[PDB]
Amino acid sequence: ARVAVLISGTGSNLQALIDSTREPNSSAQIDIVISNKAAVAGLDKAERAGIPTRVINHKLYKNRVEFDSAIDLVLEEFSIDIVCLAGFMRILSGPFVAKWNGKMLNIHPSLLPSFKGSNAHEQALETGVTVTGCTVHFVAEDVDAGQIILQEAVPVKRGDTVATLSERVKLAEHKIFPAALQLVASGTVQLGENGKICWV
Ligand SMILES: Nc1nc(=O)c2cc(CCCCc3cnc(C(=O)N[C@@H](CCC(=O)O)C(=O)O)c(F)c3)sc2[nH]1
Ligand SMILES: NCC(=O)N[C@@H]1O[C@H](COP(=O)([O-])[O-])[C@@H](O)[C@H]1O
């Protein structure tokens, strides 16, 4: 399975995905890394691993649909089968999401459906949970509401901050995201016609 990884930032999840897909038994190959922001650290991790990169500045486009179309063009150029959103922060448009339905995965740093949106850790800390986690799900049109593939709980320790909590949660992200990609890449898991997770 040919994979594109979209990033907006540091690329720790990207790096975990690079490491896992180099394993001999990997069912996925990362063929392109797309960033919507220039000179982010994930672009370096990609070049060090010998993976093509492309910056598609969202700031240059009239609206989401145009910008998504620019991404889609690169996805076709590279005959991509699966899209991983790994720290990619731009909400995608309906048509793009529908096109990639069942082929696009996103990592989210909470146990969905808790704490959807961009600042999950802040919410988690403000709410006072003692267990949080991360969620790999298919991208549906409703942000952070697509079908759930894997999750891993992570404890909240007293005194935690966004810095310390997100650091612990990212250790789980680097486990379940490579695992979720391998499940989809190998056809073990797919989005069902009824729209629920299907473990073939
Ligand atoms: N249809 C669809 N379904 C999905 O499940 C899904 C998941 C995605 C992964 C991205 C993370 C989820 C998320 C993204 N973005 C924002 C946000 O407010 N983003 C600002 C830009 C802020 C910035 O640039 O840092 C904006 O895009 O306007 C947010 F609150 C939460 S994208 C997507 N699209
Ligand atoms: N709303 C989406 C979101 O919060 N994404 C989060 O951004 C980080 C990216 O880190 P990375 O750039 O080191 O992979 C990850 O912690 C991921 O869960």
How far apart are the CA of 118 and the centre of ligand 1, in A?
7
Cβ-contact 110, 120 below 8 angstroms:
yes
Instruction: Name the nearest CA neighbour of 124 among 172, 166, 91.
Output: 166
Q: Could you list the residue range(s) of the whole structural domain that residue 154 is in?
A: 1-200
Q: Provide the domain count of the chain.
A: 1
Q: How far is the CA of 25 from the centre of ligand 1 (A)?
A: 32
Are 116 and 144 within 8 A, CB to CB? yes
Known binding-site residues for (6R)-10-formyltetrahydrofolate equal 64, 89-92, 106, 140-144
Q: CB count, 10 Å around CB of 190? A: 16
